[PDB]
Structures are given as C-alpha cells and as structure tokens.
Design a protein around this ligand. Structure first.
Ligand SMILES: CCCCCCCCCCCCO[C@@H]1O[C@H](CO)[C@@H](O[C@H]2O[C@H](CO)[C@@H](O)[C@H](O)[C@H]2O)[C@H](O)[C@H]1O
Ligand SMILES: CCCCCCCCCCCCO[C@@H]1O[C@H](CO)[C@@H](O[C@H]2O[C@H](CO)[C@@H](O)[C@H](O)[C@H]2O)[C@H](O)[C@H]1O
Lengths: 148, 148, 95, 290, 49
C-alpha cells in the first residue's frame, strides 16, 4: 500500500532532518507518493502576449489548482511554468562599495525592518473596566516601501 | 501569546492552511483565531475514514510547514489530536472550605487524578477546564528598571 | 539573581517573583464555589456502562487519599437514558 | 453578572444545580472576556412529574426572571437532540471573499445580503456573528536620535506582552518562567507613553510614538483559506426547505458583488452532495417482491 | 591583510549565488524575498575580480 510506504519514508527522513545544513532545513524538504497515470493535459494561454509566464502561472495557482484538487478521483495535479511570485532585489557592487558598505550588513538591515510585531493588550489579572488590544505596523507590502 | 488576531491570522494560519490542503477525502476546513493568541484549526473527513489514518496524514502534512513559522510559535510548539465527540460523564472537584484557589485545584487534578483516569479501558480522552498550570511569574516595575 | 554590579542590584528589589498560573481567561464555578471540571469521553466502538462503573469505582478509591478540604462530586451522566431504555424494553417483552 | 444569574437561578423549584463558565463563548467554544455560559441541570425525572415542571415551563420562567437584569443580553436554550451535530431545521452558509477585498467590504456585503433576504419571501429571520465594533488602540511610530526600531518594539513586546524564558523543575515535572509588567502599570491607555528605552541615555516614548482609538473585530474565522462570514437562516413557515436554497441562490446571484462567493457548510452540503439517489430502492423492493 | 575567509565566502555567496531573507504577504498568501547581484555584473569570469 502506498500510504504505509509514504509513512515509513516520512518517519525515516524526519529523523535525519537535523543533520542537514541550515539553508536546506530553513527552506524545507518535501516527500510525496507518485501517481503514474495521467488522464488529461490542459493549457492556458494569452493570445495577445499581454501577460508573461510568471503571472499566468501564479493565476493558475491562485484560481484553478484549488478547484481541481477537490475533485473526486484526482490523485495529483502538476504545474510546469516559471515559478511563484517573489520580491527580488538586484544589487550593484560598485555603488555598495561607494558607501563603504558590505552585503551582509545590507541583509541584516533588511531583515530587521520587515518583521511583524506582537503587542500585548491593555487592561488584560487587572482591575480595569475595559481591555483594549494594541496593534502596530509590521510587514511591508509594496515595492515603494521596500525601496524606502 | 501577546499577538493580535490579524497578525496570528496572517503570519501563522496562512502557511499552515496553504500546506495542509490536499489530503484525500476532505469536506472543509475551519480556522479560528482569538484575541488572547490562540489558533484552532479543525478539519473533518468523509464518513467511513479511519481516524488513525486521518491523524497520520494530518501529522505528516503539518510536520512540513514547521520551519516557516515564527520563532515563538516553534518554541512553544503546536499540537494535533483526533476529536472524540461522545461524552459519557462529567465530574467536578470542589473545595468547600475556600482554602484552595482555582490553579491549585487544577494542578492537583493534573498531577494524580488524570493519569489514573486516562489508563482505563474504553476511555478516549479526558479534558480539563479551569485555570492554567503552575509557572514562575515575575512582574516588573518599569520605573525601577529605568531608575537603574 | 544578580543583574548589575556597581553596590549589587538583585531581582527582589526590582521585580516581584511568585508562583501562579500560566494562563488567565477562563473561570469555572459550581454554585458560586471555586472548583474544577473534568469531562470524560469514550473511544469509538467501546462499552458505555462499563467505563462509567469503572470511573465511579476508581473515584471512590481515590477519595480516601484526598486532603481535608477537598471533595469530588458527580454532576452529569448522559449514560442514564440508554440505561432506562433497555430496562423499559425488557418490561414490554415480559408483558 | 454570571454569579448573580446563578444565584437567581438556584432558587427555582425545578432546578437542581448550575455550573458556570465566566469567560467562555458559544461561537466555537472559544474564550471571550465579554461572554458567559451557564448549564442548569434539573432534578431527577420522578420529582418533576407535574405539568408546570416540564422543561419548557422552566425555560419560560427562567427567561422571565432573567429579563430584569438591565446589565447584559441573556438567552436560554434547550439542549440539542444529538451532540456534535448542527442545526437540522434551518441552514447555514459562508460568505467569503475570493479576491481578498477586506473587512469593511465583507461587512457591507453581509448587510446588503440581510437586507435583500428580509425584502424577499420564503425566508424567515436570519442571524449572523460578524462584528467589527470592538474598540482597540492603534500606535504609530515616525522615523524622526540614535534609538532603534528593534529596541522600541522589544520593550513593548516584553512589557505589555508575555515573554517565555527558560524552564524550571518542580514536583518532578517541568514548567515555564514568564516575564510581564505589573498589573497596575498597564491598566490605562496612557501607560504606553510612560515606558523608557536606551540611547547611552534614558528616553521615554512620549516623544516617539502616538496612540489613537480605532475599531475592529475580536475573533477571526477563516473558511477554506479565505476570510468568511457566517449566515444562519431557515425556511419561512408554510413552505418546505427545497425552495429555500433556490431562493437563497437566486438572491445571491444579484446581491453579491464581484469577488464574493457563498457556500453551504453543514448538513445541507451533505444533502446536496449525496443528491436524490436513494429513490430507486422502493421500486427495486417492489419488483423483487413481485 | 586582515580579511577573513568567512567574509569573502559570504560576499561571494550573496552576490554570485542567492540568499533567501524573510517573507512577506501579498494576495492573502506568503511569498519570499531574495537577494542577488544584477545580471550585467555577473556575466563574465573576470567580474569576480
Ligand atoms: C452539565 C454538563 C452538560 C455538558 C453538555 C455538553 C455541552 C453541550 C454544548 C451544546 C452547545 C450549544 O448547542 C447549540 O448551540 C447553538 C449555537 O449557539 C444554539 O443555537 C442558537 O443559536 C443562536 C445563538 O447562538 C440563537 O439565535 C438560536 O435561536 C439558537 O438555536 C442551540 O440552541 C444549542 O443547542
Ligand atoms: C463542562 C462541559 C465542557 C464541554 C466541552 C465539550 C464540548 C465540545 C464541543 O462539542 C460540540 O462540538 C461540536 C463540533 O464542533 C459543535 O457543535 C455545534 O455544531 C454547529 C456549529 O459547529 C452548531 O450549529 C450546533 O448547534 C452545535 O452542535 C459544538 O462545539 C459542540 O456541540
């Protein structure tokens, strides 16, 4: 039975996970069974060349895969495109060295200004008639905020 | 602890929901985030599915999304369990003399009663509703801290 | 615990330490008396009255070691209804 | 309030005991600071043999006595016939945003749906639990002295919120050590302005952040990965339940704007999924008997 | 000189390779943030110098 094999493989890999380097374990590894039978292939194109591969693949991920996966009898659904969305920064070493700056300091700086904040409530074993939650600004969302 | 409902709904629940969906024979999933900083995700299965297999599949899927969670959540840890609907009895434990408070009674029940009441034949699970367990609480005075 | 050395600054004169509960937000009362509640669930495909009788017996056994100001109580048991139903059934058959 | 209610209820001739949970909510059995539940258990079946000691009479008398509290909203309900099952007379559904519009848009859509339903026949009263009226505080920090954002956030995280540091051993088991501010020093909205931070010099937050009062929800329910709101209802008297779903779908085809969808959740979902597929068994049995 | 092997290795890894730093949220989902050098500055073997 494939389920027992998958369970055994997962139990085996979970034991050996801690010995892996920091990068691979922080990114994570996946395990899954294989379905050899294919029933249909379906494409989804832009005739006017208005949208590239990345947006089209992400749209298929967002709006198509979820509905198809819940169907009855479907084993797995594949996707061969250009990858999911990401916020990419391209550096210029000349300008970085112009400011007596190093790349690791830049990585540390960007990692500390894009974190979420957890704030406790006000008047939570207290003797106040009201209790109010506190929230602040956490993660950035737009490209201008990242550039600022 | 110390988190706001929107923060726990966005940062914590989203990766878990995005990873969990896809297992065989589901109907729906529900997630609830509460103001005090508790997240509860319940997933039901079609009738006839053995609870052990469903629990194993859910464990295998949740074990993959752990590294993407925040440091505090990982340090505290998440827990998964199969739900038992049927009830057979409830019993209360009281302190008529008002000599013992809520926390001491709860921890006394935890220490010796629950362990003996969990090992009988036919018992699925037992709960406990009341105050929390023991902890070393230090209350700080910001004025004295800033003085030094 | 020593924090800063200058004169020594301890934890006692800066903060107050104690032993308490780790979570607040849920209180349970029975007739305006502080108490704790524990419900018992069954496992699928088990017996109903056997587990109940064993629970009563083991609670009676544990009641001997309780301190002076601690006592237990039975509040709700929804296993009674079937207890009635089967009983009624037998009567009908006999009649 | 719950103590007073239990004291009032423990004087009824028919009741036996009352268990109270001040701080527990009925919407999902979660924790809420402005809600409470009381289970009232009655006397054995032999004593309450009179007509006025039935469950309905007890509920009516209890509601009449509770209607004079002038401090909270109090309701009394009977037990469900089967534990763990949803309502079997009415129906429930979820209104959810595929496009991730927001909270205000979802609330407006819910209000418009309720208005359209109340403007249409073959539907009874409808209920919901979506609320955005809970007050709260919002703090903003400007980028105007050597102070770091990390420190000014960590001070607020550790003082107002709880921090879990290390562990300790007692009674043979292991417990945790937590740090938090004293209760009298965090019970007012202006106490956030009295904290201090480093840089080496002591500086308060009175010249760094501002605080305002805003509104928002208290519990967040997510259904199938998207934010959703719950809508309860039932067929109007005089009609069956078959036309109720058709009417709901018809009105939802127009009252719902773009990016908003609706979905059946409990019981009705299973009835639709199973369909009318067991109607052949009677003809099959008749043919077999013949 | 006072340089360290870790320093040059980290610079080479961040510039020529890749580095996944933190996450963000968009369209109700979580995505990654990555750092890499510009393409025209990593097109020739001499660019390492
Ligand atoms: C003594 C110990 C006994 C242990 C009992 C075991 C716990 C049982 C929990 C039952 C949970 C509540 O069970 C069910 O809750 C729903 C949801 O609110 C109530 O449903 C209610 O909805 C709303 C209020 O929320 C009302 O407008 C509606 O008229 C009413 O039906 C039902 O009337 C009740 O039957
Ligand atoms: C001391 C007593 C403590 C009792 C604690 C155990 C009760 C556990 C919950 O037990 C049961 O769970 C089911 C399934 O989620 C939920 O059951 C509920 O279903 C739907 C909503 O989901 C409601 O419309 C319905 O009226 C109610 O039965 C309730 O939460 C509770 O009826």
């Amino acid at each position: 039975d494939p389920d027992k094999a998958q369970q055994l493989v997962q139990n085996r890999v979970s034991q050996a996970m801690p010995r892996l380097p920091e990068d691979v374990q922080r990114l994570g590894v996946t395990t899954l069974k294989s379905s050899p039978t294919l029933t249909m292939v379906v494409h989804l194109t832009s005739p006017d060349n208005r949208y590239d591969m990345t947006y089209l693949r992400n749209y298929a991920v967002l709006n198509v895969k979820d509905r198809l996966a819940r169907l009855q009898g479907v084993g797995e659904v594949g996707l061969f495109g250009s990858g999911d969305y990401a916020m990419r920064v391209w550096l210029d070493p000349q300008k970085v060295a112009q400011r007596n700056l190093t790349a690791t300091e830049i990585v540390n700086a960007i990692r500390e200004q894009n974190i979420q904040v957890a704030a406790g409530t006000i008047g939570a074993p207290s003797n106040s008639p009201l209790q109010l939650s506190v929230n602040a600004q956490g993660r950035l969302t737009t490209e201008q905020e990242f550039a600022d | 602890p110390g988190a706001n409902p929107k923060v726990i709904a966005e940062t914590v629940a989203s990766p878990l929901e995005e990873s969990i969906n896809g297992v065989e024979d589901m109907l729906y999933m529900q997630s609830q985030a509460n103001s005090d900083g508790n997240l509860t995700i319940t997933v039901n299965f079609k009738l006839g599915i053995d609870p052990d297999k469903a629990q194993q599949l859910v464990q295998n899927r949740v074990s993959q999304a752990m590294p993407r969670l925040p440091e505090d959540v990982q340090r505290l840890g998440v827990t998964t369990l199969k739900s038992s609907p049927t009830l057979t009895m409830v019993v209360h434990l009281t302190s008529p003399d008002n000599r013992y408070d809520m926390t001491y009674l709860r921890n006394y029940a935890v220490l010796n009663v629950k362990d003996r009441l969990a090992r009988l034949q036919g018992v699925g699970e037992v709960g406990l509703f009341g105050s929390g367990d023991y902890a070393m609480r230090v209350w700080l005075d910001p004025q004295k801290v800033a003085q030094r | 615990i020593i924090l800063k050395t200058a004169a020594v600054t301890r934890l006692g004169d800066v903060a107050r330490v104690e032993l308490a509960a780790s979570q607040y937000g849920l209180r349970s009362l029975l007739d305006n008396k502080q108490a704790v509640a524990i419900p018992i669930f069954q496992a699928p495909g088990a017996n109903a009255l056997q587990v109940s009788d064993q629970v009563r017996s083991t609670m009676k056994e544990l009641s001997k070691d309780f301190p002076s100001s601690i006592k237990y109580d039975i509040v709700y048991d929804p296993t009674q209804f079937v207890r009635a139903s089967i009983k009624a059934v037998v009567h009908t058959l006999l009649e | 309030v719950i103590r007073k209610m239990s004291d009032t209820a423990l004087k009824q001739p028919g009741v036996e005991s009352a268990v109270a949970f001040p701080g527990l909510s009925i919407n999902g059995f979660t924790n809420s600071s402005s809600a409470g539940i009381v289970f009232v258990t009655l006397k054995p079946f032999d004593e309450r043999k009179a007509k006025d000691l039935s469950a309905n009479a007890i509920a009516g008398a209890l509601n009449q006595k509770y209607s004079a509290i002038q401090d909270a909203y109090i309701a009394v309900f009977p037990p469900p016939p089967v534990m763990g099952l949803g309502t079997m007379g009415g129906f429930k559904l979820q209104l959810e945003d595929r496009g991730a519009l927001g909270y205000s848009a979802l609330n407006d859509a819910a209000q418009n749906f309720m208005k359209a339903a109340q403007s249409a026949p073959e539907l009874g009263p409808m209920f919901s639990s979506y609320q955005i009226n809970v007050p709260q505080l919002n703090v903003d920090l400007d980028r105007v002295q050597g102070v770091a954002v990390t420190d000014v956030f960590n001070t607020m995280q550790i003082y107002l919120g709880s921090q879990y540091v290390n562990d300790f051993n007692r009674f043979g088991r292991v417990y945790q050590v937590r740090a938090q501010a004293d209760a009298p020093f965090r019970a007012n909205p202006e106490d956030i302005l009295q904290l201090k931070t480093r840089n080496g010099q002591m500086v308060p937050l009175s010249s760094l952040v501002n605080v305002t009062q805003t509104y928002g929800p208290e519990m967040v329910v997510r259904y199938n990965g998207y934010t959703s709101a719950d809508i309860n209802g039932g067929p109007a008297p005089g009609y069956s339940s078959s036309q109720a779903e058709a009417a709901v779908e018809r009105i939802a085809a127009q009252t719902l704007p773009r990016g908003i969808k609706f979905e059946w959740t409990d019981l009705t979902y299973q009835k639709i999924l199973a369909g009318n597929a067991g109607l052949w068994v009677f003809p099959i049995s008749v043919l077999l008997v013949f």
